[PDB]
Design a protein around this ligand. Structure first.
Ligand SMILES: [Mg+2]
Ligand SMILES: [Mg+2]
Ligand SMILES: [Mg+2]
Ligand SMILES: [Mg+2]
Ligand SMILES: [Mg+2]
Ligand SMILES: [Mg+2]
Ligand SMILES: [Mg+2]
Ligand SMILES: [Mg+2]
Ligand SMILES: [Mg+2]
Ligand SMILES: [Mg+2]
Lengths: 139, 55, 125, 179
RNA sequence: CGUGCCUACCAUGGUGACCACGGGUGACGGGGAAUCAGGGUUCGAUUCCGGAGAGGGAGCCUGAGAAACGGCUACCACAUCCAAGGAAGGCAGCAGGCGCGCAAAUUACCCACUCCCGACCCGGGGAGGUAGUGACGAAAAAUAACAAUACAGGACUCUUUCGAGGCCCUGUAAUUGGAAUGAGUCCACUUUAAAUCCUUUAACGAGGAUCCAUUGGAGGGCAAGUCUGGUGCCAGCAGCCGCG
C-alpha cells in the first residue's frame, strides 16, 4: 500500500519527487545535459553552411543510398548529416549555401531507413525546397 | 564512397503530360451543396452495401 | 423633408448653452451636411446659425438615423468662450497657422543654445 | 502603455476524431438540410449547446433552495423563452437538458425566413438575406446567422429594395438598352 | 525613530534530516493564461499592482522626495572631435541603424480624446491618440451564385399508368431576370485635430479569356482507385508497420 495517513504529505512529496526521474521524459526535459550536448541549442530551426555532400547507406529491408549534406551551423559550429528531402533536389543544393535544417519527427530518435540522419533541409538561400521542386522561384 | 549520381533518375525520365482544361469549381456553400446532393438525398434507389465513390 | 427629433435634452446654465441629442432620419439621400442640419436647428429654435454649433454623426447601417449633439449659444463671444478653438474653425472663426511639429521643436532647441539678446535674435528669426 | 482592449473568445469547436465515417453522415445531412456554408458553423451551434449544458448541469449540482440557483436557473430559462427554443410551459432545468441541435437550426434567420415565406428553396434564401433584401423591424439586417427571437418574430419589411420598394440602381442599365 | 546598525565591554550562543547551509536555474514575483471529467500538468519578460537597473560597478550636490543617470565626479571597458593644448560622452525612452540571430513594425501626423505638469481658463507632453506595415491570432463572411423554363441522369405518393405533379435534385460549358449583391473605378456628404477606414449616398461594375480556392493525400492505422502510363531494391515515398 501507500503511506495513507493524514499527515504524510511531505513523505508523498519526497517520494513523488524521487520517482519521477526514472521516466525517460522528465529526465531529458529537466536535466542540464540535454540542453548543452545537442545541436540546435534548444531551438526549432537553424540556418547552416554546407561543408560538403555525403551519401549514406541504408538499412536492410529498404536497400538504397540516401543523399544528405554535411552542415556547419553558424550558431553551434557542429556537424550534421541533414537529409536532402525531395526527389531530385540533390542538384538544387550546392556548396556554401544557407541551408535551413530541422528534425524529422522526434529529437531522441531517427527515421527507420538511415544509419544516423536526424535532420532535414528546408531553405536554399531563403528559397525552400518546396519552392525549388515546383513553382521554380530561383536558386 | 558511393555515388551521388542518379539525382532524380525517375524525375529525369518522366514523360510529362500537360494538365488539361477542366471547368472551375464551386466552393464553400455550393461545393458542399453538391457534395450532399451527390450521395445522401439520392442514392436510395439502390441498397447500401457497395462502396464505389472511385472504383 | 428630413425627419429630425431631439430626444435627450439639457440646459447648461453653467456654460450658457443647450445640449440636445439629434436623430436625423435619412430614408433617402446621402447624409445631410453639417451646414444644413445646423440650419434646421437654427430654424427650429429660430436663432442665428453663426452662434449655433453641432458635431458628430454616425450612420446606422442602411437608411436609418444619424446621431449627434446640438449646441446653442447666445452671443458669438459666448460661443467663442465655451467652445474649443478647433470647433469654431470649421466655420472659419479660428486659424493658428503654426500647427507643425519639428518647427516648434527645432526652435525649442536653438533657443536653448543661446541665452540673452542673442536669443532675441532667434526668438525673432 | 496602450488601452484599447485585449479580450477574445473562440466561438468554435474542433472535434477530436478527424476521420469517422459515422460523423460525416450526421454532418453532411446537416449541411444540405439547412443550407449551410461550412462545417465550422455546424460546430458553433454545438459550442453553444456545449455552453448551455455546462450551466444546465452545474445548476443541477446545487441544492434546491439555493438562491444562486433560483436567479441563474430562472434567467437562463427566460432566455430560452425569449428565443423560443422551449415552450412557455415547462420551466425546469431538466427540460433544458432535453434540447437538441435542430431547434437552433430552426431559429436561424433563413429558416424563420423559410417559415415567414418569400424564401424559396433554402440555398436561395441564404442569398436574399445576403443581398440586402430582408430586414427585421427597424434595423437593417445583413448577416445570415441571425437568431430570430420571439419579440420580433414577424416583422420582415424591407423598404426601398427591389422586390418590395423599387429603386433604380441597375434596371436603368436595362432601360438604357431599351431607349 | 525602534534594533549588532556600527563601536566598546561581557556572556557563549544561533540554525540543522520538518532538508538547514552549498549549488543549479532556460527564476522577476503576483494577479493570470493554456489544457477542458474529477484531480492535476506546463508556461506567466509581456498593458494591472510591487520590486530592480540605465555599460560595469563605487561616490555625492540640490531637494519634502534621488545614492537620480534625457544630474554631476573618478576609475575600468568601449568610444567621438581637434589647430594635439584639450572638450563632450551613455536609446533595455520614441522612431531609425548596425551587430546578433530561425526570430519581431516607418527617422509619420497631432495634444482632438484620456490624464499629468507649471506662476497657469492660455504654454507644454513620441505618456498617450492616430495613420503606414502586420495571416501571432480572433469575429462575422461571398468565392460566381440563385430561383425559374428546357434536354433528361430519372427517382418519389398515387390510381394497370408506358406521369398528372401546386412534391425533388441532377450532367446541363442550354436561356433569363431581381441588370440582383458586394469586390474596384470613383462626385458629394459624413466620421475625423485635418486626412484615412467601416458606413451612408450618385452613377458604373459577372454568363465561364470572366470579378477564380487552395492545401494535403488515396495499402492498413485513416476519409478516399487494384485507373492508366513511366520506374524496375536504382530513383525514391513513408512520423510506425513497410512499398521498389
Ligand atoms: Mg483545464
Ligand atoms: Mg484545476
Ligand atoms: Mg511596475
Ligand atoms: Mg535609482
Ligand atoms: Mg533621468
Ligand atoms: Mg538615454
Ligand atoms: Mg504531395
Ligand atoms: Mg493514388
Ligand atoms: Mg479507408
Ligand atoms: Mg506525415
Amino acid at each position: 500500500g501507500k503511506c495513507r495517513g493524514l499527515r504524510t504529505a511531505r513523505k508523498l512529496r519526497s517520494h513523488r519527487r524521487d520517482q519521477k526521474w526514472h521516466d525517460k521524459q522528465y529526465k531529458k526535459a529537466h536535466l542540464g545535459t540535454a540542453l548543452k550536448a545537442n545541436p540546435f541549442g534548444g531551438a526549432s530551426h537553424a540556418k547552416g553552411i554546407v561543408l560538403e555532400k555525403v551519401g549514406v547507406e541504408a538499412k536492410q529491408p529498404n536497400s538504397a543510398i540516401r543523399k544528405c549534406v554535411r552542415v556547419q551551423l553558424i550558431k553551434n559550429g557542429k556537424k550534421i548529416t541533414a537529409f536532402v528531402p525531395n526527389d531530385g533536389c540533390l542538384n538544387f543544393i550546392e556548396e556554401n549555401d544557407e541551408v535551413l535544417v530541422a528534425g524529422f519527427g522526434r529529437k531522441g530518435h531517427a527515421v527507420g531507413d538511415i544509419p544516423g540522419v536526424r535532420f532535414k533541409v528546408v531553405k536554399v538561400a531563403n528559397v525552400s525546397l518546396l519552392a525549388l521542386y515546383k513553382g521554380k522561384k530561383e536558386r | 564512397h558511393g555515388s551521388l549520381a542518379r539525382a532524380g533518375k525517375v524525375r529525369g525520365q518522366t514523360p510529362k503530360v500537360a494538365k488539361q482544361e477542366k471547368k472551375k469549381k464551386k466552393t464553400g456553400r455550393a461545393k458542399r451543396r453538391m457534395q450532399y446532393n451527390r450521395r445522401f438525398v439520392n442514392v436510395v434507389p439502390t441498397f447500401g452495401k457497395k462502396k464505389g465513390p472511385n472504383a | 423633408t428630413v425627419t429630425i427629433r431631439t430626444r435627450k435634452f439639457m440646459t447648461n446654465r453653467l456654460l450658457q448653452r443647450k445640449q440636445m441629442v439629434i436623430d436625423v432620419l435619412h430614408p433617402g439621400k446621402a447624409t445631410v451636411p453639417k451646414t444644413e442640419i445646423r440650419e434646421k436647428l437654427a430654424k427650429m429654435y429660430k436663432t442665428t446659425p453663426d452662434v449655433i454649433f453641432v458635431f458628430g454623426f454616425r450612420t446606422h447601417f442602411g437608411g436609418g438615423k444619424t446621431t449627434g449633439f446640438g449646441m446653442i449659444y447666445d452671443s458669438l463671444d459666448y460661443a467663442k468662450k465655451n467652445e474649443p478653438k478647433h470647433r469654431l474653425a470649421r466655420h472659419g472663426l479660428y486659424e493658428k497657422k503654426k500647427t507643425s511639429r519639428k518647427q516648434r521643436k527645432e526652435r525649442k532647441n536653438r533657443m536653448k543654445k543661446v541665452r540673452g539678446t542673442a536669443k532675441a535674435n532667434v526668438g525673432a528669426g | 502603455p496602450v488601452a484599447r482592449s485585449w479580450v477574445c473568445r473562440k466561438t468554435y469547436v474542433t472535434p477530436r476524431r478527424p476521420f469517422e465515417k459515422s460523423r460525416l453522415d450526421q454532418e453532411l445531412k446537416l449541411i444540405g438540410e439547412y443550407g449551410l456554408r461550412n462545417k465550422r458553423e455546424v460546430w458553433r451551434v454545438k459550442f453553444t449547446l456545449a455552453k448551455i449544458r455546462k450551466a444546465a448541469r452545474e445548476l443541477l449540482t446545487l441544492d434546491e433552495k439555493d438562491p444562486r440557483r433560483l436567479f441563474e436557473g430562472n434567467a437562463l430559462l427566460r432566455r430560452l423563452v425569449r428565443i423560443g427554443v422551449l415552450d412557455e410551459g415547462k420551466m425546469k432545468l431538466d427540460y433544458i437538458l432535453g434540447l437538441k441541435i435542430e431547434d437552433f437550426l430552426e431559429r436561424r434567420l433563413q429558416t424563420q425566413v423559410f417559415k415567414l415565406g418569400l424564401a424559396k428553396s433554402i440555398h436561395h434564401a441564404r442569398v436574399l438575406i445576403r443581398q440586402r433584401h430582408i430586414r427585421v423591424r427597424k434595423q437593417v439586417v445583413n448577416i445570415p446567422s441571425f437568431i430570430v427571437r420571439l419579440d420580433s418574430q414577424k416583422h420582415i419589411d424591407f423598404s426601398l429594395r427591389s422586390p418590395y420598394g423599387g429603386g433604380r440602381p441597375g434596371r436603368v442599365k436595362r432601360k438604357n438598352a431599351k431607349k
